[PDB]
Design a protein around this ligand. Structure first.
Ligand code: HEM
Ligand SMILES: Cl[C@H]1CCCC[C@H]1CNc1cc(Br)cc2[nH]ncc12
Length: 380
């Protein structure tokens, strides 16, 4: 609905994101749109230090506030990581830390670039009378020339949007169950699986828009956070807002609400039996917009789809359920192949880790999540 801020077309993505700020903030917008040139020239920190503190008060509506979060988060990652080879700043200047943390407190997000910034709000249509396809879209911000951030973020978005075509169906699932409407339940489950299967096919475009070296040695550096990170082992000082430094985890698709939400729907015990996997995915919910965090706990308050299906001795209903689970398994198995190409192999070619968001061991995290999904199948 509108209380959960779910768009009928793009789901959890911010529909038609704002591309321009109020003239007042032109000195934010100039740095953010020139992070590649400004980083390469050793000038980015300077241009940021030369800024004046700006009030967040001329950011009147939600889309303005979301764009500014994106601006400031990207600037913050540029400031902290610099050229991306290990010369890092552990203090973020008040002229930026302060409106960043104010705007953040307002939107109930942490003061760091999150998935909802750099994917869900970091896009535009080129031509608005053409649909949501890669050739009709661009991102609004990048970090370095050749970082494949347009590829990574838009392919990420297009998989989101495809998967979000199944959110539509969730109220049908629970109404069907409450109304003991066997046939519509089953058709609804089959439709959710069709959407998750299409999402996998969209994922296949990753290879054309991202290459391994750029992802592993550049993009991944600028998405990284300061939680569990030796390079900023105590956190980052938000000068002029908080006294001590604070840890926050980097961007992660574990912050995506669509995939968490099909784990909840299908009763895959992703945030439960654990343990590292489940605690991580629970933590990442505090990096989601508040209404999206609240959709997820609302789903959890509904009766279990899994228990309903398990208890019915109905082989077609079990197949439809399994078809949804299987689709999550196929997505996650494909995803580990991508993690092999874009992380593990480049990692091997360097003069067992390489960590993962918030310090995690990432192969174990992803294999545990996949295994948990596979073992939710009712039949092999
Ligand atoms: C170069 C491409 C990609 C790489 C290297 C990659 C890597 C990773 C890694 C290392 C994790 C572990 C969690 C973390 O450390 O933050 C992760 C989690 C995740 N990634 Fe990706 N990813 C890529 C693209 C995508 C895309 C396009 C999707 C869209 C479906 C995606 C969906 C997810 C999800 C949902 C999770 C949470 C784990 C789960 O639900 O199974 N990733 N990804
Ligand atoms: Cl590799 C790991 C640890 C090092 C920093 C980068 C994270 C992955 N972060 C992601 C960010 C976004 Br946006 C979207 C993502 N999809 N899948 C993974 C992911």
């Amino acid at each position: 609905s509108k209380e959960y801020h779910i768009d009928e077309e793009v789901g959890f993505a911010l529909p038609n994101p704002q591309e321009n700020l109020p003239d007042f903030y032109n000195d934010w917008m100039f740095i953010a749109k020139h992070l590649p040139d400004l980083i390469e020239s050793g000038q980015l920190r300077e241009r940021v230090e030369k800024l004046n503190m700006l009030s967040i008060d001329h950011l009147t509506d939600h889309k303005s506030q979301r764009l500014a979060r994106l601006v400031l988060g990207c600037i913050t990652m540029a400031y902290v990581w610099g050229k991306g080879h290990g010369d890092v700043r552990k203090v973020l200047p008040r002229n930026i830390a302060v409106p960043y943390c104010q705007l953040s407190k307002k939107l109930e997000l942490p003061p760091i670039l999150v998935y909802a910034d750099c994917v869900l709000a970091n896009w535009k249509k080129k031509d608005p009378n053409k649909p949501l396809t890669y050739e009709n879209m661009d991102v609004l911000f990048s970090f370095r020339d050749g970082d494949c951030s347009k590829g990574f973020f838009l392919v990420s978005l297009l998989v989101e949007i495809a998967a979000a075509s199944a959110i539509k169906v969730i109220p049908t699932v629970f109404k069907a169950m409450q109304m003991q409407e066997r046939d519509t339940l089953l058709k609804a489950l089959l439709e959710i699986a069709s959407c998750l299967e299409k999402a996998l096919q969209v994922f296949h475009q990753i290879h054309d828009h991202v290459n391994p070296k750029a992802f592993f040695s550049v993009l991944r550096i600028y998405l990284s956070g300061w939680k569990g990170n030796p390079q900023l082992s105590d956190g980052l000082v938000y000068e002029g807002f908080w006294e001590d430094p604070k840890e926050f985890a980097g961007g992660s698709a574990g912050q995506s609400s669509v995939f968490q939400c099909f784990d909840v729907l299908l009763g895959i015990q992703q945030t439960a039996g654990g343990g590292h996997a489940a605690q991580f995915l629970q933590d990442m919910r505090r990096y989601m917009p508040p209404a999206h965090r609240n959709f997820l706990c609302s789903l959890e308050s509904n009766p279990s789809v899994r228990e309903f299906v398990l208890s019915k001795g109905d082989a077609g209903l079990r197949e439809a359920y399994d078809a949804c689970v299987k689709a999550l398994v196929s997505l996650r198995s494909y995803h580990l192949q991508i993690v092999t190409k874009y992380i593990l192999i480049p990692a091997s070619q360097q003069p067992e880790e390489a960590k993962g968001t918030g310090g995690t061991d990432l192969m174990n995290f992803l294999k545990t999540v996949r295994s948990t999904t596979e073992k939710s199948l009712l039949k092999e």
